[PDB]
Design a protein around this nucleic acid. Structure first.
Ligand SMILES: Nc1ncnc2c1ncn2[C@@H]1O[C@H](COP(=O)(O)OP(=O)(O)O)[C@@H](O)[C@H]1O
Lengths: 442, 85, 109, 96, 97, 96, 80, 109, 96
DNA sequence: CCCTGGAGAATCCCGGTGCCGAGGCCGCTCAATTGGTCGTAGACAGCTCTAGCACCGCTTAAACGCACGTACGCGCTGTCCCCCGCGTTTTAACCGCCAAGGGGATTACTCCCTAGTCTCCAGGCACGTGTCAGATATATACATCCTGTGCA
DNA sequence: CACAGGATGTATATATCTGACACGTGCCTGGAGACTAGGGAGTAATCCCCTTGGCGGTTAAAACGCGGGGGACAGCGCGTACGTGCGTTTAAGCGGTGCTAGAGCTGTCTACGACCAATTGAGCGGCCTCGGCACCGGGATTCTCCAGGGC
């Protein structure tokens, strides 16, 4: 279908959208299950809406369908369903026991709907009800949730009776080949039921070519200047060295040695006793007792007398607290988006940081907070105080400011501590990123 | 320097929990000063039992406390427990 | 030739391991020598005590509309019987609960 | 194939089927029964050992077991267990 | 106007309910934290099996239930209906603790 | 004439008997009681003198401790007179 | 053989109570004390006679009494 | 030739019989084997406890203006010490009496 | 023809002359002390035997005696006793 | 008024008796000394699965907080009878002594019971596996409190 | 003061589902069969000790009665703190990442410390004997309780 059908309302599909629709239709005609890796921001939901509308209109047996989405995207998917293709009817399962029972026994059990939108928790709670209805199409958004086998959600989603299946995920490869095998096993269990140049790389490419479709965000926009990166090696403070030696040699409970070395290369004040006594002042103690803090104290004012609008990503709330203390000492505007920030407090913070004429300067973010959102286009500099094992998490954190709404250069400064575990972490992350590249980017 | 303390763990034994224990004991009305005494006596009991269990675990040259060590400690106290060993 | 092997439990008409009891007695450092009839006597006594407690627990389960025995039934059987309660006075049963017991002064009047 | 752990579970099940033919038992109840049998065995063996040491003998016999049963069990249980043990010993001596 | 029970009906109702059950009345995670805090003083870098904490909780609940039963007996002996720290102390003194 | 108030002689007796260490029961009546109780368990039982003395010592110690607990119960009840209710409460809490 | 429990006399019970530390004695407590004494003696003598019969003797010894008391949880120092 | 006998108590500097403790451990049905250091350790512990009790009892006797120790002195020493009282909390000392105390509510107003 | 009975009497007397040089002891007190020594010996030895059984070993060692002392004696008594026993063991190992 | 006198009990100092603890001897049995052996425990690899650390998202039951009213704990009074202090009379404990015999304690001997060994094999234990009993949810039907309303 | 009725909690059926109990199977290791050797204990006999039975005198202790005060127990009143129900907050519980090591469990090898045996000499238990500490009585003191200036 070289052109989008007429059932789509509120706009017409794009060329990449219609070619993805054709890919999905070829997949269904061949009777195969596949993965759309079109990356976040390239209309995966719109393509799936178009596929469901095709199945409802051009084919005369639209049966029960189920779409699994994160709870943070239920409203967005329902809105897209109602706007783009109003000809199809969709229902959502969310709420407590009484709301769930009312919804099921009033709309679901009678059986007049065609598409059911549920989140993971509601699927686990209502697996008995959702298990009864024969399923014609199972859509899983952000499919990297079911990577681990023998997880409850993976077992429950493989227990259903589904004629056709589909996965939507921007990052099919995260750490190993086992997750890719798990996704392909969910797709076609018969074909992939084992332990997944010529002997390597190329063989994987030939295997995955029929069952995959990924388009990098470069053939659509032709804008958004590419990623710029700088790596900064930093030595630690002297008490940081002393504590590093103390932890290496072996009274405080230091069970996970790697877990201690992590923060110990960030700031020793996280340990008990490394702080000064009763006065607990916040004047220049933080700066001189962490080399990364010294380098950040150098970097931030220069960006401020320059483009400013910096994002700082860290992997620990304690580190975020210390950074908040430092920012208060330096009299900077700071915003803390963390796991503990209530949902309403996040939205106004994001909007105010994105206000057309703002004054906010520092935005502290835990690297795994929120997810698949947060459009901080006005930001310029992205500072990764730490780095985690998955390079995908770092990539999504750095592209949270590198979005289609960005118009100027964005730079990512990555701090690393020499002769410590940070070298191991960064080299592992690079190994996983190169696996991702050499297996995916083609 | 930015840290805070949530609550002492002996306060994690809550007032409704102590009330439920008293209800199973067969108590109708409870004075408000009961909860501190209950926490104290529970702390004493736990300290004795845990000291005996840690002694057993140290003797076995292990760093893990086991249900068998706990039941041996209870049998030493004179509180034989059936169902774990 | 070699005669057929018959268990000492079969000889004594018991459902308990006389041989295992003898081995436990000899390995338990109770005395340097153990008699022949001592393990038989001990196995019979253990069997009788098990029979008593199991009969009471099965009665409790039957009046509780349940086929299987649970620690609650074990506790209900151990209590409500004077001799067993005296024998197991210092014993705690996991997930056993307490007997229903409300003092007469607390009853509404 | 892990290490072998010995328990009185099968004998408890046999006695259970003897007493109540149509009834069952759970894992926790069986564990409690195993603990009860172990504890009673320990008490009886220890009392018999102490009797033998007090009387300056080196052998634990059916007389010692009977006396320990009388010392540990409360009355009616003691007399019933004594009768059962004497009957079993008579059967064993008569047989082999 | 709204329905309300007399002061003591819900107490007896709860007595019957919790004497009919066998569940654990304390919260598992707070009890685990208390156990770890106590054991830290005796020895550092100590690990607990999950079953050890469960056995500790069972024994502690049984001890507290027996103590409260004796406390209630003392309070009834004192011509009262409320239990008091006096009753707890008397029960402990007579039991020998 | 001279007459003491009701309770000073009691305190004098308390002090003197807590200071002393003798036995407070008559030996021949205690021995007769012991022999009569022993008549229900066996006939023609002979007793060493030390056995009777040890039984008397244990019985007196037990009764003294029981009276201490009973006095505590009576004081808890805001009284000064010990009662069978106090004795029964003490026994029940001890576990007898 | 009777009246010898009544040989455990009111002055003797009062002396025991005074050593315990009591001031005023109700009149109903003497029978209760006699019953308690009978129960205690019954248990101890039962165990002692069991030990004697196992020893195949006819004389009850201080050693038998001490062993009985120890096995009931009331260890006695001063007789062996 | 052979050297002159030297007792293990003399070697360890104790006043209690290491050899007799070793013999009692061997004949007491505690374990199949007994180490060399266990009798020495146990003799030292027994000597320490005896010395502590005797010191307290001698102080109590001198408080009585007597030279010889009696069961009353032993009882006073044991019951006036917290840890010894805990150790001997279920023991009866013959001809020992009780600690003198009167509850304050019984004293004259 | 009275067979030989053993006692700790001479050793208790030696300890008494060491701690209180000019203080004597009576026969009843000596009997009480002998009984105390026997009771403590039995408690510690039984605890050590149970420890050996729990750890599935065949020999009783100074490690087991130390653990049994830590279990039985409370607090400062246990600390001082452990110190004394360790000193005695070191002296025995060096002298021999 | 409290403070003083009387009277009884408790305390302290001295002198004469009794017996029990401390010391000195004999002999015999148990502990020390050498020598030889083996099996127990230490030490060390390899494997594997649970446990700990710092977070994130989500749900919901439980906990916290709060205001009200009501049984209830506590104090104060009054009565009366029960318990205590004291004198008198009687009964049986306590002590000393004597007489007889049952029975505990010891020794010598023999046998019969049990420890230890080797062979054999079957009962018990770990591993899969499937069906049923118990848990849960949900609509009924019943029993239980509690208050008002004629009774005043 | 005694029912009617309302509201609420609790028992009762019935239908669904799931995960644990009960069963079958293969293997292996510990119990049975047959045997021999040696020493623990059953049996008989002897001695002497220590328990029991009895008598007589003593005196302390128990039993009985009497009189009176203080403590127990019922009753009333108050004002207070705890139960009860509702609304808001928090963290307990569940399901996930994300690495590593870590700690416990099993198999193998090998040395040293504990058992065992024979031999011998002091350490210790039993037996006497004797004098100093405890005891017992007596007589001169200090404390404490009870009645009254309502002394
Ligand atoms: N019809 C469309 N045509 C072009 N771009 C679109 C369209 N719909 C959404 N987008 C782009 O997709 C981005 C968000 O991606 P995503 O949430 O995946 O979209 P969808 O929910 O439609 O799949 C937006 O920034 C927007 O620019």
């Amino acid at each position: 279908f070289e052109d989008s059908p007429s059932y789509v309302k509120w706009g017409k599909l794009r060329d990449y959208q219609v070619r993805g629709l054709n890919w999905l239709i070829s997949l269904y005609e061949n009777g195969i299950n596949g993965i759309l890796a079109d990356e976040m921001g390239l209309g995966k939901t719109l393509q799936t809406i178009s596929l469901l509308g095709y199945m409802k209109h051009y084919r005369n047996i639209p049966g029960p369908h189920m779409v699994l989405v994160p709870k943070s995207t239920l409203h967005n998917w329902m809105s897209e369903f109602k706007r783009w293709v109003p000809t199809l009817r969709s229902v959502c399962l969310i709420g407590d026991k009484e709301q769930r029972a009312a919804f099921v026994r009033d709309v679901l059990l009678p059986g007049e709907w065609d598409v059911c939108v549920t989140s993971y928790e509601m699927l686990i709670k209502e697996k008995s009800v959702f298990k009864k209805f024969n399923w014609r199409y199972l859509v899983i958004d952000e499919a990297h949730r079911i990577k681990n086998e023998k997880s409850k959600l993976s077992e429950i989603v493989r227990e259903f009776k589904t004629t056709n299946r589909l996965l939507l995920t921007g990052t099919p490869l995260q750490n190993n080949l086992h997750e890719l095998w798990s996704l392909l096993n969910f797709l076609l269990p018969d074909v992939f039921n084992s332990a997944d140049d010529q002997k390597l790389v190329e063989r994987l490419h030939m295997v995955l070519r029929p069952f995959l479709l990924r388009r990098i965000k470069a053939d659509v926009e032709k804008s958004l200047p590419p990623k710029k990166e700088v790596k900064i090696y930093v030595g630690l403070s002297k008490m940081q060295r002393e504590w590093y030696t103390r932890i290496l040699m072996k009274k405080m409970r230091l069970l996970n040695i790697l877990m201690q070395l992590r923060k110990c290369c960030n700031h020793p004040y996280l340990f008990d006793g490394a702080e000064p006594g009763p006065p607990y002042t916040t004047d220049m103690h933080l700066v001189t007792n962490s080399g990364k803090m010294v380098v950040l104290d150098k970097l931030l004012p220069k960006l401020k007398e320059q483009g400013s609008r910096v994002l700082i990503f860290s992997q620990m709330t304690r580190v975020l607290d210390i950074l908040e203390d430092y920012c208060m000492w330096r009299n900077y505007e700071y915003c803390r988006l963390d796991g503990q920030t209530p949902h309403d407090e996040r939205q106004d913070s994001i909007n105010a940081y994105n206000e057309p004429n703002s004054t906010k300067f520092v935005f502290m973010l835990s690297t795994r907070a929120g997810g698949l959102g947060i459009n901080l286009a006005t930001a310029d500099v992205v500072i990764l105080y730490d780095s985690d094992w998955n390079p995908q998490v770092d990539l999504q954190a750095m592209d949270r400011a590198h979005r289609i709404g960005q118009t100027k250069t964005v730079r990512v400064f990555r701090f690393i501590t020499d002769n410590t575990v940070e070298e191991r972490i960064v080299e592992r992350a690079e190994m996983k990123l190169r696996l991702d590249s050499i297996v995916i980017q083609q | 320097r930015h840290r805070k303390v949530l609550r002492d763990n002996i306060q994690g034994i809550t007032k409704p929990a102590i009330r439920r224990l008293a209800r199973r004991g067969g108590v109708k009305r409870i004075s408000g000063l009961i909860y501190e005494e209950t926490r104290g006596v529970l702390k004493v009991f736990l300290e004795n039992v845990i000291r005996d269990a840690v002694t057993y675990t140290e003797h076995a040259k292990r760093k893990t406390v086991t249900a068998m060590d706990v039941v041996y400690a209870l049998k030493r106290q004179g509180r034989t427990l059936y169902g774990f060993g | 030739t070699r005669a057929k092997a018959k268990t000492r439990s079969s000889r004594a008409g018991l459902q308990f391991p006389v041989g295992r009891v003898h081995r436990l007695l000899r390995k338990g450092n109770y005395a340097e020598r153990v008699g022949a009839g001592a393990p038989v006597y001990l196995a019979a006594v253990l069997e009788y005590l098990t029979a008593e407690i199991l009969e009471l627990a099965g009665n409790a389960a039957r009046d509780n509309k349940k086929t299987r025995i649970i620690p609650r039934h074990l506790q209900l059987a151990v209590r409500n019987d004077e001799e067993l309660n005296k024998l197991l006075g210092r014993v705690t049963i996991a997930q056993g609960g307490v007997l229903p017991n409300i003092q007469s002064v607390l009853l509404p009047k | 194939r892990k290490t072998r752990k010995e328990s009185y579970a099968i004998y408890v099940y046999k006695v259970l089927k003897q007493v109540h033919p149509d009834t069952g038992i759970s894992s926790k109840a069986m564990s409690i029964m195993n603990s009860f049998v172990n504890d009673v065995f320990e008490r009886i063996a220890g009392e018999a050992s102490r009797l033998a040491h007090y009387n300056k003998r080196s052998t634990i016999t059916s007389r010692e077991i009977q006396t320990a049963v009388r010392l540990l069990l409360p009355g009616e249980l003691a007399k019933h267990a004594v009768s059962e043990g004497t009957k079993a010993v008579t059967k064993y001596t008569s047989a082999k | 106007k709204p329905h309300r029970y007399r002061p003591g009906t819900v107490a007896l109702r709860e007595i019957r309910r919790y004497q009919k059950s066998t569940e654990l009345l304390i919260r598992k995670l707070p009890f685990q934290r208390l156990v770890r805090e106590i054991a830290q003083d005796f020895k550092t870098d100590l690990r607990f099996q999950s079953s050890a904490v469960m056995a500790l909780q069972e024994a502690s609940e049984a001890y507290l239930v027996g103590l409260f039963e004796d406390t209630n007996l003392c309070a009834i002996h004192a011509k009262r209906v409320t239990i008091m720290p006096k009753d707890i102390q008397l029960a402990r003194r007579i039991r020998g603790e």
